[PDB]
Amino acid sequence: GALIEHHAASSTDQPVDVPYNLDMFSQAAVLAQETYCGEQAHDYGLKLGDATLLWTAGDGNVRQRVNLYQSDSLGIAVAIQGTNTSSLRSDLHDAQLRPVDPDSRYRRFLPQGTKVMNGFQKGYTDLVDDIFDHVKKFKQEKNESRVTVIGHSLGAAIGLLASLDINLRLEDGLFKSYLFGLPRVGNPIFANFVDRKIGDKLHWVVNGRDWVPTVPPRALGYQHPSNYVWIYPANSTNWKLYPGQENVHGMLTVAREFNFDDHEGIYFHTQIGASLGKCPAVLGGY
Amino acid sequence: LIEHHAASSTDQPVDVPYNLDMFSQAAVLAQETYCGEQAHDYGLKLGDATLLWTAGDGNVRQRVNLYQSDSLGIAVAIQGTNTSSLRSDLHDAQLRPVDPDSRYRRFLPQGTKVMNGFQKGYTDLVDDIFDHVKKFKQEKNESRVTVIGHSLGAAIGLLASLDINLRLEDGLFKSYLFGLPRVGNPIFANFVDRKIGDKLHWVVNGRDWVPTVPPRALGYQHPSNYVWIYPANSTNWKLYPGQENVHGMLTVAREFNFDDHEGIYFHTQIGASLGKCPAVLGGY
Ligand SMILES: *[C@@H]1O[C@H](CO)[C@@H](O[C@@H]2O[C@H](CO)[C@@H](O)[C@H](O)[C@H]2NC(C)=O)[C@H](O)[C@H]1NC(C)=O
Ligand SMILES: *[C@@H]1O[C@H](CO)[C@@H](O[C@@H]2O[C@H](CO)[C@@H](O)[C@H](O)[C@H]2NC(C)=O)[C@H](O)[C@H]1NC(C)=O
Ligand SMILES: *[C@@H]1O[C@H](CO)[C@@H](O)[C@H](O)[C@H]1NC(C)=O
Numbered sequence: 001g002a003l004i005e006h007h008a009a010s011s012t013d014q015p016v017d018v019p020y021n022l023d024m025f026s027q028a029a030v031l032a033q034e035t036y037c038g039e040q041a042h043d044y045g046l047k048l049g050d051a052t053l054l055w056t057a058g059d060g061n062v063r064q065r066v067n068l069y070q071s072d073s074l075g076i077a078v079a080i081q082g083t084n085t086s087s088l089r090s091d092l093h094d095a096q097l098r099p100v101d102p103d104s105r106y107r108r109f110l111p112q113g114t115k116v117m118n119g120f121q122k123g124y125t126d127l128v129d130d131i132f133d134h135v136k137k138f139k140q141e142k143n144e145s146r147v148t149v150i151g152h153s154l155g156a157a158i159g160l161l162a163s164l165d166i167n168l169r170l171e172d173g174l175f176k177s178y179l180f181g182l183p184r185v186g187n188p189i190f191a192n193f194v195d196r197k198i199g200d201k202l203h204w205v206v207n208g209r210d211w212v213p214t215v216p217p218r219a220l221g222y223q224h225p226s227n228y229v230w231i232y233p234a235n236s237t238n239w240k241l242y243p244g245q246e247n248v249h250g251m252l253t254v255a256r257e258f259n260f261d262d263h264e265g266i267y268f269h270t271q272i273g274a275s276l277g278k279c280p281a282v283l284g285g286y
Numbered sequence: 287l288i289e290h291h292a293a294s295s296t297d298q299p300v301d302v303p304y305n306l307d308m309f310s311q312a313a314v315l316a317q318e319t320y321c322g323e324q325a326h327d328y329g330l331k332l333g334d335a336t337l338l339w340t341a342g343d344g345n346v347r348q349r350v351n352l353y354q355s356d357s358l359g360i361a362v363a364i365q366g367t368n369t370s371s372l373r374s375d376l377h378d379a380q381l382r383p384v385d386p387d388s389r390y391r392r393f394l395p396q397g398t399k400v401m402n403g404f405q406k407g408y409t410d411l412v413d414d415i416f417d418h419v420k421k422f423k424q425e426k427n428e429s430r431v432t433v434i435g436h437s438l439g440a441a442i443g444l445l446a447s448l449d450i451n452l453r454l455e456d457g458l459f460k461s462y463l464f465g466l467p468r469v470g471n472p473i474f475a476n477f478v479d480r481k482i483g484d485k486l487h488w489v490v491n492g493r494d495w496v497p498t499v500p501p502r503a504l505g506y507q508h509p510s511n512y513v514w515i516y517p518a519n520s521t522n523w524k525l526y527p528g529q530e531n532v533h534g535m536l537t538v539a540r541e542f543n544f545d546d547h548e549g550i551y552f553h554t555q556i557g558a559s560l561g562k563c564p565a566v567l568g569g570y
């Protein structure tokens with residue numbers, strides 16, 4: 001249709017050592033994986049690391065599966081199910097890709113001109129009311145003010161929206177966010193806002209030459225938030241943090257030499273992937 | 287989405303190995319394409335180059351000026367445009383990747399695609415260019431043919447350079463392109479490198495937007511080895527090897543402007559609202 005002529009930042013900052021607690025990142029990883037376990041979905045009481053399963057909705061068909069835990073280190077942890085690269089390759093076309101206004105439940109908290117990808121926001125708005133209801137319920141039952149949002153893949157995209165929304169609309173806001181294989185979600189206005197409001201809480205990681213964080217493309221006006229960890233090579237222990245947005249020393253340096261395999265793999269010693277991790281999911285070991 | 291891959295070279299930039307006298311000589315001819323009153327001043331001389339023939343008027347077809355040049359031979363310079371015009375017209379059907387025109391399609395790999403708007407710009411002129419290149423090569427006893435262009439003219443120029451090299455006896459001597467937009471897909475870009483890579487010289491000025499469009503996300507890929515003048519209009523220039531070099535233009539990903547398209551390229555001014563008419567070689 002038309003070329004996006006808006007500018008956007010591409011950071012030139014040098015990559016730094018990853019400063020985060022990787023036990024917590026790993027704990028998030030095993031929960032991200034458990035979202036792909038259908039038979040264990042309503043196994044309430046199941047414990048994965050420090051996190052005990054309390055509630056689940058969705059099934060990966062009409063709505064993404066969401067699993068909610070009490071976790072010693074993460075508080076009330078909400079993990080959202082992702083998908084695989086062949087589903088994303090099939091589904092990301094046409095109306096899905098449209099940059100749209102924020103849903104009315106949270107539109108008034110975000111800058112004017114904020115846009116997010118239609119299919120990702122839809123994935124979120126189909127779950128948001130049940131997530132909010134059950135977060136509030138279990139925060140009250142467990143006397144827990146901390147809320148962590150976690151997700152891989154489509155789950156990471158839904159997760160970014162949930163993390164920002166929870167931080168703006170729910171009392172106590174967000175504690176942490178942990179996102180794995182994150183697609184682009186919104187425009188530069190969105191990305192700057194994410195940085196401003198949840199930048200100090202947000203943790204996200206890209207595995208090697210994963211295609212997923214290259215889409216939707218910058219040419220459609222989409223922009224990542226700041227500071228991703230890049231695991232390179234994929235599945236290795238070689239990780240660094242790439243400051244600012246769309247860092248030129250990172251992903252950008254291979255973004256037309258992607259593959260469809262690195263999306264699933266080993267993230268900080270834990271397997272994540274619909275075809276890869278086990279059920280129930282195992283923490284660490286790789 | 288375009289799920290096809292494409293190369294993005296990681297090779298370090300190197301010094302520019304080119305004869306810059308010839309690149310500047312091209313630059314004054316790229317500018318003269320913008321001079322409408324002088325379009326038919328046959329005999330006019332700019333550097334080592336004498337005007338022999340002109341077609342087009344910038345309205346229905348781009349202006350093309352044809353010279354005899356001591357250093358470049360029969361030189362064909364194609365008029366470009368300004369960033370404002372490109373911002374307005376690069377939409378919808380103009381951006382579409384299309385098959386090569388039947389005149390040259392069988393010479394190009396299967397799967398080659400070029401931007402529809404730029405190919406139309408060329409195919410509106412190609413027959414007149416071919417006829418007159420042949421006419422003046424024979425009249426001047428000249429086997430060297432050089433193609434030159436800025437802006438849209440650089441895009442039309444790239445197609446001409448390849449087409450001439452494949453279809454015309456003696457092929458191409460040199461190509462000099464300034465502020466080159468993307469023109470075709472990776473198959474095109476690879477083929478350009480294979481067939482005219484050792485003849486091709488092209489340069490981007492600073493944070494010029496034009497060489498960022500059309501986007502890679504629509505399937506477009508630059509050929510190898512651009513000179514980058516950075517900052518814009520300065521004498522700091524390096525060559526960026528391979529295609530879509532990650533150390534170059536891509537490092538100012540999305541922080542373009544609409545002003546560097548016109549400016550100082552190897553000491554000579556190029557741009558529709560910036561030169562003199564007649565154009566001046568060097569001085570800046
Ligand atoms: C990182 O780990 C993943 C998961 O083991 C690897 O994915 C496999 O890659 C091969 C080809 O590269 C495919 O044929 C398999 O189907 C993939 N498995 C899955 C479950 O996707 C990936 O290749 C690894 N990447 C690197 C760079 O080692
Ligand atoms: C390089 O040269 C060109 C010479 O025109 C500069 O373009 C001008 O820039 C100013 C400030 O942005 C604009 O207001 C003018 O309209 C531009 N002129 C034209 C004809 O486009 C360009 O800014 C210079 N760039 C650098 C980095 O020095
Ligand atoms: C990917 O996920 C889809 C949708 O759930 C499923 O039908 C398919 O079996 C999966 N593909 C692979 C290769 O595992």
Ligand SMILES: *[C@@H]1O[C@H](CO)[C@@H](O)[C@H](O)[C@H]1NC(C)=O
Binds near residue numbers: 558559
């Ligand atoms: C750009 O070029 C076109 C020629 O079609 C002209 O009409 C327009 O006024 C020019 N714009 C500027 C800013 O020089």
